[PDB]
Amino acid sequence: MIQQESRMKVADNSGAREVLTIKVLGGSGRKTANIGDVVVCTVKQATPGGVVKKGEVVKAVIVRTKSGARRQDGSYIKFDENACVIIRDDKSPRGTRIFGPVARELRENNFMKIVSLAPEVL
Template sequence: MIGLKTFLRCIDSTGALIVECITVLGKDSFSHARAGDKIVCVVKKVKPASAGSNNLVKKGEVCHGIVLRTKQTTRARANGMRVQFNDNAVALINKNNGEPLGQRYLRNSNIIAKEVQRRFPKIAAVTDKRI
């Protein structure tokens, strides 16, 4: 479960490495985000500016994102299975239309929850691994 001040790993190609959750969208202010929920986050760490790297976001920028996976065990699915991942991960999206900002996911980081695939097919289209 992702709450206020939770640090998440950004796994898309926007240039952000670490983001911090500041609020959960679509729920009351005391609830926590799970896989597939929208959040508002602040970029805390970005890739270093080197030759050839073009970061789409800057440090301190406020962005919207989709939670792709969480360390906390998810709610039970219809078949009774519960899923737990090794880290908390997010993909940044456009504030206005919900389109993903990154064009691809980082290598070895493209595993996302099935709940995200159902709710956001454009986010799931850039990866082929779904659990």
């Protein structure tokens, strides 16, 4: 459950290191995004020398949340943090490698490149 003014750390190789949410795409009155949803966001903290600079407006996808998703089989998954991967106009990441586990639901949202690079797809 991520809405505007919510911060979540970045989980790939790009220069960004923390990001604040600006808007949730999908509808006129939409107010909450979860695993597999694309958001507009800004960079609040960046590592020196990175490609992505501080104060930049970028799009990104949600890979794990503290209140995860429920599967059709009646099972649940939850993580210990909210994470984020910066993506391009298409569904390809702007970084080189992904850190930490990644939810399986992205395989159902055609995010095939991010799934391949993840160390674990839970």
